[PDB]
Amino acid sequence: MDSAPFELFFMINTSILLIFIFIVLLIHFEGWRISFYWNVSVHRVLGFKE
């Protein structure tokens, strides 16, 4: 089963690259969803977590 991502990075370097591209990209498309999902506090869930 897929789990333990932190350890996965120790495998290859690309792992961090891809995630870095997908992550930074997602936030771009999510930035707009912030409105539709205003009722929810998904963003805050990560804002404080990070």
UniProtKB/Swiss-Prot annotation:
Its transmembrane ranges are 9-29
- Tissue specificity as recorded in UniProt: Expressed at high level in placenta and pancreas. Also detected in CD11c+ immature dendritic cells. Only expressed in dendritic cells and not in other leukocytes, including monocyte precursors. TLR3 is the TLR that is expressed most strongly in the brain, especially in astrocytes, glia, and neurons.
Q: Where in or outside the cell is it found?
A: Endoplasmic reticulum membrane; Endosome membrane; Early endosome
Q: Which domain of life is it from?
A: Eukaryota
| PTM per Swiss-Prot/TrEMBL | Heavily N-glycosylated, except on that part of the surface of the ectodomain that is involved in ligand binding. TLR3 signaling requires a proteolytic cleavage mediated by cathepsins CTSB and CTSH, the cleavage occurs between amino acids 252 and 346. The cleaved form of TLR3 is the predominant form found in endosomes.
Q: Which disease is it linked to?
A: Immunodeficiency 83, susceptibility to viral infections: An immunologic disorder characterized by increased susceptibility to severe viral infections, including herpes simplex virus (HSV), varicella zoster virus (VZV), influenza A virus (IAV), hantavirus, and possibly respiratory syncytial virus (RSV). IMD83 clinical manifestations include acute infection-induced encephalitis and pneumonitis.
Describe its assembly: Monomer and homodimer; dimerization is triggered by ligand-binding, the signaling unit is composed of one ds-RNA of around 40 bp and two TLR3 molecules, and lateral clustering of signaling units along the length of the ds-RNA ligand is required for TLR3 signal transduction. Interacts (via transmembrane domain) with UNC93B1; the interaction is required for transport from the ER to the endosomes. Interacts with SRC; upon binding of double-stranded RNA. Interacts with TICAM1 (via the TIR domain) in response to poly(I:C) and this interaction is enhanced in the presence of WDFY1.
Q: What does this protein do?
A: Key component of innate and adaptive immunity. TLRs (Toll-like receptors) control host immune response against pathogens through recognition of molecular patterns specific to microorganisms. TLR3 is a nucleotide-sensing TLR which is activated by double-stranded RNA, a sign of viral infection. Acts via the adapter TRIF/TICAM1, leading to NF-kappa-B activation, IRF3 nuclear translocation, cytokine secretion and the inflammatory response.
Q: Which family does it belong to?
A: Belongs to the Toll-like receptor family.
Comment field on protein domains: ds-RNA binding is mediated by LRR 1 to 3, and LRR 17 to 18.
Instruction: From the Swiss-Prot or TrEMBL record, give the protein name.
Output: Toll-like receptor 3
> Could you tell me which species this protein originates from?
Homo sapiens
The gene is TLR3
